[PDB]
Design a protein around this nucleic acid. Structure first.
Ligand code: MG
Ligand code: MG
Lengths: 110, 110
DNA sequence: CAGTATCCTCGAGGATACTG
DNA sequence: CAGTATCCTCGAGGATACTG
């Protein structure tokens, strides 16, 4: 696994290691609330990300068994990304963080 | 605000900005589940952290309005750290990450 | 379309000595 | 006790170019 080397003082740090990476929560959000997307579709939904980084974050999310990757032997190539059942289990946490973020922004910019 | 210089694609990225720092979730966990802790008491609870990093994360959490800092004019000095109501509202997310983390920790090592 | 291949920056985090 | 003052490490993320 990715986290075989790491030493944690809490299982929460492990969750953070799965979703903490720079763009991962944005990726997981789009896949969990819009279903399956091909690579170039994710890249258009996330314009500021570079190609090497988008694939890297997707690969780490796949090694963590959070994201499923499906390659089809077609021309032009076709690769689909979607959430695994464990990825789906991460959605309640992501939603909680979305609502907490909205509530936090209210109080700091008034 | 700490976040005046930062740009986000989601409100979840804001929550992550608050709690994602290297030792922050641990510190919030101790404060929310064991109450107030003095500086050296926290340093004892987290033996690996250095004093410079501990004060840094506490200052950021304070500046994010998550942690309260109380200084007493006594000898020896006495500084108490605790959760503000916004910090306490973060605990459900931390507990949800704790439970998700232990379930993940058991599944991948199967 | 959906990837690979190289090289590099920068700032979060750290070791240690000192101190009001 | 609760921190500062110096100097330093290191790797995630990014710039930039190529491709089956
Ligand atoms: Mg006490
Ligand atoms: Mg080259």
């Amino acid at each position: 696994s990715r986290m075989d080397d790491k030493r944690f003082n809490c299982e929460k740090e492990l969750t953070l290691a799965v979703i903490g990476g720079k763009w991962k929560m944005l990726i997981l959000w789009h896949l969990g609330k819009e279903g399956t997307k091909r690579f170039n579709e994710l890249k258009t939904l996330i314009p500021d990300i570079t190609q090497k980084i988008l694939v890297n974050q997707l690969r780490e999310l796949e090694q963590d068994m959070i994201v499923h990757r499906e390659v089809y032997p077609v021309v032009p190539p076709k690769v689909e990304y979607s959430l695994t059942p464990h990825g789906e289990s991460l959605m309640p946490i992501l939603e909680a963080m979305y609502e907490w973020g909205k509530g936090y922004m209210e109080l700091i910019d008034i």
